Amino acid sequence: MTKNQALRAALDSGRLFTAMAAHNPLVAKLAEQAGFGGIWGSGFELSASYAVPDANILSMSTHLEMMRAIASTVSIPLIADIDTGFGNAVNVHYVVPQYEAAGASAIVMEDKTFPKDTQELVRIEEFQGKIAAATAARADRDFVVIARVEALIAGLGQQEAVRRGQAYEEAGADAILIHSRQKTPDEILAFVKSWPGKVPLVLVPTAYPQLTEADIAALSKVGIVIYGNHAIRAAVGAVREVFARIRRDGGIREVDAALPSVKEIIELQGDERMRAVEARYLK
Amino acid sequence: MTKNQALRAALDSGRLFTAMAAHNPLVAKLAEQAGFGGIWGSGFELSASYAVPDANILSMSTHLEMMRAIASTVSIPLIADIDTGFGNAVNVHYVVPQYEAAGASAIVMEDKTFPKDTQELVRIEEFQGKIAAATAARADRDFVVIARVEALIAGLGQQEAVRRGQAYEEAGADAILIHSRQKTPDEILAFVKSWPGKVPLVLVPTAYPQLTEADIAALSKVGIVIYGNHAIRAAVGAVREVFARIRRDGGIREVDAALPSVKEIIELQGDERMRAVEARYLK
Amino acid sequence: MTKNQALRAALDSGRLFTAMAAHNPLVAKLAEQAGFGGIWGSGFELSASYAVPDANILSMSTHLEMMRAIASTVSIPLIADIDTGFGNAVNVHYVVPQYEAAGASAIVMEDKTFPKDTQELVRIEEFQGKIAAATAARADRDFVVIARVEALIAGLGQQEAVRRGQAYEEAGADAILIHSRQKTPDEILAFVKSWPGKVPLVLVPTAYPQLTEADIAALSKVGIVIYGNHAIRAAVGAVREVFARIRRDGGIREVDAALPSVKEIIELQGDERMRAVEARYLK
Amino acid sequence: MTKNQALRAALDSGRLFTAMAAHNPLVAKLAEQAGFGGIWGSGFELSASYAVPDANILSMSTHLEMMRAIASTVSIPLIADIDTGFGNAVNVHYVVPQYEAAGASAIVMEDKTFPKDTQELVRIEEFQGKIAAATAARADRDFVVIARVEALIAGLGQQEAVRRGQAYEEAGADAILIHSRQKTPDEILAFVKSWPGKVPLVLVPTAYPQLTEADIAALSKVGIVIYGNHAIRAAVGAVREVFARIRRDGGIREVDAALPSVKEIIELQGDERMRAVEARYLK
Numbered sequence A, B, C, D: 001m002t003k004n005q006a007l008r009a010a011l012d013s014g015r016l017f018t019a020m021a022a023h024n025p026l027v028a029k030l031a032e033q034a035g036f037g038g039i040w041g042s043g044f045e046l047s048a049s050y051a052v053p054d055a056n057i058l059s060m061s062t063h064l065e066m067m068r069a070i071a072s073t074v075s076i077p078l079i080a081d082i083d084t085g086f087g088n089a090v091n092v093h094y095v096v097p098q099y100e101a102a103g104a105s106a107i108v109m110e111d112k113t114f115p116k117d118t119q120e121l122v123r124i125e126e127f128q129g130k131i132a133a134a135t136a137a138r139a140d141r142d143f144v145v146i147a148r149v150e151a152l153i154a155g156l157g158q159q160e161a162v163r164r165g166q167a168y169e170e171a172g173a174d175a176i177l178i179h180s181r182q183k184t185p186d187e188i189l190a191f192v193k194s195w196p197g198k199v200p201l202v203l204v205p206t207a208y209p210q211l212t213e214a215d216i217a218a219l220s221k222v223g224i225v226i227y228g229n230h231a232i233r234a235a236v237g238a239v240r241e242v243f244a245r246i247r248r249d250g251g252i253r254e255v256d257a258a259l260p261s262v263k264e265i266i267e268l269q270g271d272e273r274m275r276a277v278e279a280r281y282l283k
């Protein structure tokens, strides 16, 4: 099975698929090794790793190349975040085949207007055009197009969020990511209970961590849960602490023991494979 | 003071300068905030973050662009690792002005032969040519060229390591990074005691962590200590643990509390500055 | 004089400054050698060279890196085309310092809305915000910000085109590029005669080639003329003809004599400089 | 048929395959349209277009990304120039899958030592290792690995050039590119007459243009002829002339008529396709 088939199989199978954020190939490799179903090529994580806001500031090329590098490192599906498609439906048409060719198995595109204005979401028909352009542009039918509905977040209400989801599924979306920034899952659970569409839902429970996977498994309508930014957060927490200790201790004499060893990083780098290559071809 | 002046001032001042590894701008920003003197644009860390060996596999462009991005984020000097110069003295000549223009305040270039052969170091005169090409190519005289001597590691002995260091300083090196993979500092300390050159030494005590900064401060001949790969190691240690917990707990309900908050990452991303910009220019 | 000073000197001097399109560093080098005042880092030319439409499809990174490469090759000022700023005023703020750091001496930003809609220009105050963000973001005050007014092209009339130009100059534009796609210069000349602002105008006479430099010199209000796309056009014309001849002749036996020699390209590549470098540093 | 199959079919078919140099996707598109069999992703042409010597100065990433862009534009096979493999057999192993994934249908790798020394070619067994690494690294067996023999050029004689070719074919090369800088084809024709290997030869007759395709068709042992640098040469010849005319005429009033029209470039950019996309998806 190709990665695209694998993701499509997980969605048609009814099993709940988990995807973890990654800001580089090493972190994606660790997510694979930890057992997550797929990698989330998070725009928030990559822009955070560049110390720039997640407000379409980071170059699209930086993100597309990071997706290429991650897909060439892991064997599990990569779901790439393409923000608002980097433009209108015409840009979508030109952009999607690049993400597919980079090896992503899905893209997530949201209906926020872009760029931000000094009215928060684009018109329903305009987004329908963008999703239809994305599905028209993909080569492999198994590649997945996920439409992200921002209407709850934009404060437009549940009726409108469901109306948009249905319009997007009618335009070709393979799944609907309904988002919420509330600190409790009530708004999301009410949307789920009311969702009437045939395609599966996608949740990013970052703001409402109390909704566990067992709680999500109980929602037959959800096929994917995404851990949106826990790798960059974990990284920051530990780097900041090790740096503060090194400066307080005046050195690495204390901190060294606790850290993963240099040998462990060399193994994560594929040293083994490289030695086989040197042994069989360096002459 | 420009960053190049700042680094040159630290070297001429006699104070011991500390530089910490960083594999992205966010980590470089944390090193700055923790109080390190400069950033080490480590080839080992960047290749590890790509999950490829540190054996000249990673594209030079990937590293040069990462240096640009780090220098545009921090206010402290960036010392860039240029491995063996990506080629001979002619490549050095073309490559150095790019690293300088990217905003690096120094480059470290080692005398290993390249590419690796199926004799371990290049000829002394050939490396002298490479260092002279680097110093000839730089525009700002304050930009620093550091020659890294691999002779101890290559097992060529102390006499040869010192002979090479002196030849490189005679060719124009502003400092000599003497390296060692021993688990105790004896080999390095004996080299230091014997070093007769006028330029300062640089140590990367990764393999012999028991040599503390107070121990290094006692070596008047050393002007720089570099923490070679502690950021990627710290990152791996924490990402791996958070991923394993999320998979064991079936969710983020437990791990969320401990992590730095999303709001903390947004602040590290420069959200404040961005709000001032939106407030004064988005109309 | 730095390049930014040189461009500012040409603008304050009253002399008419000429800038020629270039789609790569070699073509920019030829423009310099032909005697043009500066290079026009045309988005139309670079997208045409990629065989994609000039409709914000080409990655911004591809263009920014091409500007870097051109500025590192020529000694004359580079005026970079940044389309609509790749976003709103916030993107402008983040984008301008990158073009400045790449070595461009000016940017040209137009008031078209972006992305294109299924109302043609952005609101006057919104563009004023974008220009003010650009001038706020530049480090060197000599770097030039040129506002391009699309109102004639958008069919909004002369009064509105002048109103926009004046608003942009009031927001900080150092010059106003008034554009026209008419096949005669009447619309442009009438705008010029009516222009009341203090800053100089910029013309791109591509569509009305009969307006010569002597005709433009007679317009004291114009300080810059840009040849918008003549390099890619010339290139296409000759490549297409040589390819057709090679296929008709079944070889290069006939076409070879007419072509510039391989030795001539090697000289344009800086072979001389490289031999001096090899001679003095390859040891 | 995929492009790799198409190239393999041309090689097994006995027909003579023609490939033309291209320094960008537009020029590659013109070569396709002129009727050449494939595109030659020339390192000389791309470095010349950057105004840097063809001496491994140009970044490998710049070339790899240009190959991606060319392959995404044309429908015919792309033969990519990978110089000496950017390193030893280990680099070859890591580099080949990237060129394959970029969409190249073949790579050409030469046996020159690298980097150049202050002995001209690598050891036969070392190159055999590099070619075996390339064939081991490719995913699709149809992808073609071409070994370029520099022994004639290095002045090592015909016996050694043939010995190297045979060793490389024994290591897995699908074809042997025998090169010569002589101004007459005698050296090349004598090598051809003596060539005993089973795989086809590749010629780059740039220096001896009098060897026509009809002359090459008569050499049953040659399966590919490459026009090495005629696109950049044609481009330079015409750009230089148009620039000189514009400066002599003080404008474009005279030169405009002769040039391909702006409308012609817009068509080469895929405007048609883009209008269909806008018409069916921009809503």
Ligand SMILES: O=C(O)C(=O)CP(=O)(O)O
Pocket (backbone or CB within 6 Å): A021, A042, A043, A044, A045, A054, A081, A204, A206, A228, A229
């Ligand atoms: O991870 C991301 O980039 C996301 O799109 C989800 P967020 O908008 O909740 O950060």
Ligand SMILES: O=C(O)C(=O)CP(=O)(O)O
Pocket (backbone or CB within 6 Å): B021, B042, B043, B044, B045, B054, B081, B204, B206, B228, B229
């Ligand atoms: O950090 C690096 O990349 C170094 O050059 C030091 P190392 O060789 O000890 O890893």
Ligand SMILES: O=C(O)C(=O)CP(=O)(O)O
Pocket (backbone or CB within 6 Å): C021, C042, C043, C044, C045, C054, C081, C204, C206, C228, C229
């Ligand atoms: O050369 C360009 O890209 C221009 O902006 C001028 P045009 O819009 O007339 O092509």
Ligand SMILES: O=C(O)C(=O)CP(=O)(O)O
Pocket (backbone or CB within 6 Å): D021, D042, D043, D044, D045, D054, D081, D204, D206, D228, D229
């Ligand atoms: O076109 C190239 O880059 C070639 O490798 C052939 P050359 O070495 O004859 O230029």
Ligand SMILES: O[C@@H]1[C@@H](O)[C@@H](O)OC[C@H]1O
Pocket (backbone or CB within 6 Å): A032, A073, A074, A075
């Ligand atoms: O080669 C891959 C290995 O590295 C890992 O990710 O597990 C699955 C494989 O396909």
Ligand SMILES: O[C@@H]1[C@@H](O)[C@@H](O)OC[C@H]1O
Pocket (backbone or CB within 6 Å): B032, B073, B074, B075
């Ligand atoms: O702007 C910079 C700030 O972000 C920090 O790094 O401290 C020093 C400043 O120059």
Ligand SMILES: O[C@@H]1[C@@H](O)[C@@H](O)OC[C@H]1O
Pocket (backbone or CB within 6 Å): C032, C073, C074, C075
């Ligand atoms: O070095 C430059 C040379 O190459 C040319 O462009 O003329 C001016 C110089 O500054």
Ligand SMILES: O[C@@H]1[C@@H](O)[C@@H](O)OC[C@H]1O
Pocket (backbone or CB within 6 Å): D032, D073, D074, D075
């Ligand atoms: O779409 C392609 C077209 O643009 C051209 O190159 O001819 C063959 C096609 O596959």
Ligand SMILES: [Cl-]
Pocket (backbone or CB within 6 Å): A023, A024, A049, B023, B024, B049
């Ligand atoms: Cl990273």
Ligand SMILES: [Cl-]
Pocket (backbone or CB within 6 Å): A023, A024, B023, B024, B049
């Ligand atoms: Cl990164």
Ligand SMILES: [Cl-]
Pocket (backbone or CB within 6 Å): C023, C024, C049, D023, D024, D049
């Ligand atoms: Cl080009």
Ligand SMILES: [Cl-]
Pocket (backbone or CB within 6 Å): C023, C024, C049, D023, D024
């Ligand atoms: Cl290019």
Ligand SMILES: [Mg+2]
Pocket (backbone or CB within 6 Å): A042, A043, A044, A054, A081, A083
């Ligand atoms: Mg996002």
Ligand SMILES: [Mg+2]
Pocket (backbone or CB within 6 Å): B042, B043, B044, B054, B081, B083
């Ligand atoms: Mg290193």
Ligand SMILES: [Mg+2]
Pocket (backbone or CB within 6 Å): C042, C043, C044, C054, C081, C083
């Ligand atoms: Mg333009």
Ligand SMILES: [Mg+2]
Pocket (backbone or CB within 6 Å): D042, D043, D044, D054, D081, D083
């Ligand atoms: Mg070549």
